[model samples]
Target: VPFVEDWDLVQTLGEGAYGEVQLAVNRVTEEAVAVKIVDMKNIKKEICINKMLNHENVVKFYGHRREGNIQYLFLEYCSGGELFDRIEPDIGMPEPDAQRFFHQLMAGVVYLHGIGITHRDIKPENLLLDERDNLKISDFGLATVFRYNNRERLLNKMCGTLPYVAPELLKRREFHAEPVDVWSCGIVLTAMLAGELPWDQPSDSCQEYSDWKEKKTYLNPWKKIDSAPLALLHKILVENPSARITIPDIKKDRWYNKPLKKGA
Candidate 1:
């Protein structure tokens, strides 16, 4: 509200599930920024997550202020747009491009997990590209802090987009926080490579889900699409949380360890 006089709204960017984001420029410095206008309740989670995260692959939150009824979040402007917009339904990125994006995505996840945070939602739409095409993780509205007890910390809350959600989060009453995040990451990596979601709402009752749950080799999507990364996908997409690959384990996989192209 008070800062309205500080930054001039330039144009509407796009609508999010909670609210709309707009392009704005600082009145004094004329520096461009993205302004997120959202309800205080909905914006609080994202604000907390963004504030705690400090990384090159994570979006920067400049500041926040409350208007009379709504809260405003100032963030770094990413002109390139959402990663989801660039991916076609079934025609995904080339191998090298997929590798590049996946590496950055995993790096962000690794950093968050190291700090005891879990980005419950990890989808293409939540990933943004800067003008330089470097991918940055965004939209932490569903993020939650998790810690290990005698057992892996299980989160009871069911949150996240449908297609990208992990199976255990939907079926089990209690599920470990970190494995679910890894599952979602595997789904995202698949989309980046195949340009499409493998299926809608992975569930135990569904035939496709059962096929995957049973580890039916023929049903695996990556089998023939491009087998180079199939082994890595298998590790991350396991239905059992305990058997699922962790971020550190993923980084050790041969496919992920392949040298990045120069300047990638």
Candidate 2:
């Protein structure tokens, strides 16, 4: 267990409306830790959040404990910090670094899929990292079990960032979560590489909804982006949700096999 006595609160690392994160020192081990204090009222959607949250590339949950109205989740400290924070202009992160993180991030998603959990809210802000530059998926408040074979229904929920949200999610009434997760990942990957959102989404009234889908691929604006394999991007972010690539595609995709070409 971690205690305050052994180490001092080095600094107020960051804060959000709901709660704050502090960089703590483990008194006994003399190691760094990230203590995420989540206000209970803000964490509503989770029927069983931390219980289902476990994976190699995902943040390690140090069990749940409460202090008054705040829910404390002592997590593995990642000195590298949040991906969203690191991707800023002065952070010195390049396209190669982004690609590397993308590979590891996808690995985490693959693990999530294996357990039938769908990470509805996937964005740069949700990915954390370790000292050795290992990426971990963080923030499980919006995650849910999408399907469990015949027993589980096609899980659907209006969640995730608007830009990263999948096309099927907006179109279909009750779409499966897995496809949406994949779509979001594709967007995140594009953002990491291009350093921006890929395209503007559909409006309420558009007769050419099907043709409008092509914007995601065609409007991509990265310097010499054409040099990178469009086939890989197309495969992962296919318009047809059914055709959207999953964890399995990593093995064959050039981004996975030829990371060097992708600025890795």
Candidate 3:
């Protein structure tokens, strides 16, 4: 397909379970952009549902174009890059820095929950950073916008990254997005402070479930880790979705008061 008047593909940003995401530039406007190029043949679920999503922490829905077999999804460009790239074998941001990130995510996620949108996939990889280092949630392929006023369970779709899946999700086919998001957020929190997945293993089945259950918050003491603080992770990773921390609960934390400034 020909470049639309101004937009020019720059470079590939990343890829997900579905397709490749890239960086582009709008020549006339001279604005940098990010894009997700998906396979049209792959379009089945979620595409129709995602057309109506709107939220702060979530990536804004720009527009999509079809070119024969491929689909181009135009998105707002976030320059800072992935959170995982910053982490080395033994390096990560400080605790306060981690707190600041969690604060931003909490605000955005709270807005999402209030509007009845559930980000089924909430992980460090899903959390993108802007040029200012502010966090924004992306990758809504697994996200489901539910009805807040109704008791109806729309879909029993067991969708999500397995590492961050709340225990209850594995137990029950029918589940809600609220508690599941909280559980995933806990893993994000741990990754921020610890700079890696706590689980460190490849198991979460009925047999290994006992151990992999809290692996998202699992840590290595050789890095001089403290296990006590991780108790909060336990609450978020509870086997029962009803027992997981809700979005409102996170908003009440004082660490969330980061003003928009470099030092802040």
Q: Each candidate's TM vs. the true structure?
A: 0.89, 0.81, 0.81
Query: Candidate 3 has which clashing residue pairs, if any?
Result: 199-215
Residue by residue across 190-236, what tens digits does model 2's lDDT show?
A: 66666666555522444233443544444434342444544566676
> Any runs in candidate 1 off by more than 4 Å, and if so which?
1-5, 40-42, 148-153, 213-224
Clashing pairs in 1: none
Give the best candidate by TM-score. 1
Give the TM-score comparing model 3 with the true structure, all chains together.
0.81
Q: Rank the candidates by TM-score, best first.
A: 1, 2, 3
**On TM-score, who's better, 1 or 3?**
1
lDDT of 2: 0.69
Candidate 1 residue-wise lDDT at 175: 84
lDDT head-to-head 1 vs 2, winner = 1
